[PDB]
Design a protein around this nucleic acid. Structure first.
Length: 89
DNA sequence: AAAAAAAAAAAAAAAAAAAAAAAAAAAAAAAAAAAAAAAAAAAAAAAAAAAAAAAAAAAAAAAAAAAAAAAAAAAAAAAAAAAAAAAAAAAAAAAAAAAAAAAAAAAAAAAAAAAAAA
């Protein structure tokens, strides 16, 4: 409600947050976006991989879990944007 | 004779697959109606042909809507930046014909055995 009411302070805080995010992004090394596994494209990746939607590395994570039961438990609870799970055996 | 790798003991971690039974849907492959398309007959509206004709381009000339000039003002389109869609170029691949190595049948002949004759 406070953000909805006061526009100027909200814009200033958003500007500060964007500046901090850009400063964080400046420290990252150069990288290339990767073809991610999806419904339309699999890219020759394993069937047990539950890949994310983020095409950019440095904003994605791989969780190496012990098995398929833990794999299902982690796949049910995660963030599809970033988290990816590769259940081992 | 030294090095290296497989395999097996037993408590641990973690997975995978084939069928039965009924009822509904979804692919995917066929006969079979159904209409384009094509070959080969007779058949019939159009060009030809000719004579005969009269309706609209020329020509005189006024005048009345006009396209260039002048001005003010609105703002469509073009080129430069970026950001997506969609197609040839090139390289890769799984079955698939070709080749080579091992299992089963074959009889020639003899060792050992079993059996019986006088």
């Amino acid at each position: 409600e406070y953000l909805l009411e006061n526009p100027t302070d909200a814009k200033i805080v958003v500007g500060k947050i964007i500046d901090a995010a850009r400063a964080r992004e400046a420290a990252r090394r150069a990288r290339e976006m990767t073809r991610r596994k999806g419904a339309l494209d699999l890219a020759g990746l394993p069937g047990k991989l539950a890949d994310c939607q983020e095409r950019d590395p440095a904003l994605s994570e791989l969780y190496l879990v012990e098995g398929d039961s833990a794999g299902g438990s982690a796949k049910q609870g995660r963030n599809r944007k970033n988290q990816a799970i590769l259940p081992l055996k």
